[PDB]
């Protein structure tokens, strides 16, 4: 998204299409002159002429058939018992599929994720609210419904709740550099009470959100709060999103990635190794350095 | 002495360009003013309905919008299902 100043002349649409508003409307449009607008039903999709993770599989390849649609009845009508006959944690993986089906489909989308959003479990409510910001995702707002929706789970203390709104968080300003939204999350990632693999997440969303910016207080906070971790806790399994935050952070820049990796440079091997080679990679990607 | 301003509601694919004004004596149009409209255009009770503008969140009844940074040409999302008791 390009910010800029209402003195240009028609300047209401061309934020609009910048925003990709009208891309949903083309989209379903074009899809229903195709004809291609029938909900594909996973179970034809694997040809079943001749359990609780594979029924997971199957909602989530529903949900990426239909993604982008917003025309899908199975999670829609029975959304509700499919989610209730889900079993452990897929529940937000479901709802997160119901917010694939519609996304860049703001108006809609959010209506039929409302009644979602009131639900009683922890994981149905964090996958509702990552379902928002799926939907908000890529797409632009002029009031940026997510910022809103996302009040008090963007800094929520049950992890899984404050899990599916970072990432909604991420997944919606990714590409935004939003001042606000960045000033809000940080402060999330600086929290200790999260997690290991939750901060990663903030990692993640910041990441995305401050993409090739070279963000200085987005990397400071990285290497802070990987400073701040202990080592052994942190070479677990989990902390290879900070490095990936960080090769976001300096996309296709390159040259100044040394003053990133000498600071880095304290840290034991195991995981300098691993983080400052990430970082080097995405910075250079696109650029064929033998 | 009708504060009249403009504000774009969209909610449900459906998008209005209302020019609402205070009634309930302020001076300005208020979370109060703007509820009575929404309520009375549709019916969503205060307790569910949620209003979003410039990605603030709406949780004070109180909080004049006005103040908050309302003006012409501003659009507000309205998020909800259309209650027909």
């Excluded at chain 1, 009040?151 to 970072?166: A, C, F, P, Q």
């Excluded at chain 1, 900070?242 to 990796?261: F, M, Q, T, V």
Aim: hydrophobic fraction near 40%; aromatic fraction near 6%; charged fraction near 20%.
């Amino acid at each position: 998204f390009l910010e800029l100043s209402e003195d240009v002349e028609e300047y209401e649409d061309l934020t609009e299409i910048m925003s990709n508003v009208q891309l949903n409307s083309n989209f379903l449009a074009l899809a229903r002159e195709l004809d291609i607008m029938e909900p594909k039903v996973p179970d034809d999709i694997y040809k079943t002429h001749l359990s609780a993770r594979m029924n997971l599989a199957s909602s989530f390849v529903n949900g990426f058939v239909n993604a982008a649609f917003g025309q899908d009845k199975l999670l829609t009508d029975d959304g509700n018992k499919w989610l209730y006959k889900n079993k452990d944690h897929g529940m937000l993986s479901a709802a997160a599929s119901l917010g694939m089906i519609l996304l860049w489909d703001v108006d809609g989308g959010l209506t039929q994720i409302d009644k979602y959003l009131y639900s009683s479990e922890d994981y149905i409510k964090s996958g509702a609210l990552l379902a928002c910001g799926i939907v908000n995702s890529g797409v632009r707002n002029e009031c940026d419904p997510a910022l809103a929706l996302l009040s008090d789970y963007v800094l929520h203390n049950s992890n899984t709740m404050r899990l599916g709104s970072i990432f909604g968080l991420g997944l919606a300003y990714a590409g935004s550099n939003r001042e606000d939204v960045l000033t809000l999350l940080l402060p999330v990632m600086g929290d200790s009470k999260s997690s290991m693999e939750v901060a990663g997440v903030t990692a993640l969303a910041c990441g995305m959100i401050a993409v090739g910016s070279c963000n200085g207080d987005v990397t400071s906070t990285i290497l802070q709060t990987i400073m701040e971790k202990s080592e052994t806790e942190l070479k677990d399994t989990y902390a290879r999103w900070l490095p990936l935050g960080l090769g976001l952070n300096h996309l296709g820049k390159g040259e100044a990635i040394e003053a990133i990796l000498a600071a880095l440079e304290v840290v034991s091997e195991p995981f300098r190794s691993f983080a400052n080679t990430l970082v080097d990679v995405c910075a250079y990607a696109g650029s064929g350095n033998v | 002495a009708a504060a009249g301003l403009t504000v774009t509601v969209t909610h449900s694919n459906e998008k209005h360009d209302l020019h609402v004004t205070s009634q309930q004596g302020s001076s300005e149009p208020v979370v109060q003013d703007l509820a009575q409209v929404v309520e009375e255009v549709i019916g969503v009770p205060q307790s569910f309905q949620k209003l979003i503008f410039k990605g603030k969140s709406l949780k004070e009844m109180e909080t004049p919008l006005s103040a908050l940074g309302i003006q012409d040409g501003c659009r507000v999302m309205l998020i909800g299902k259309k209650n027909s008791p």
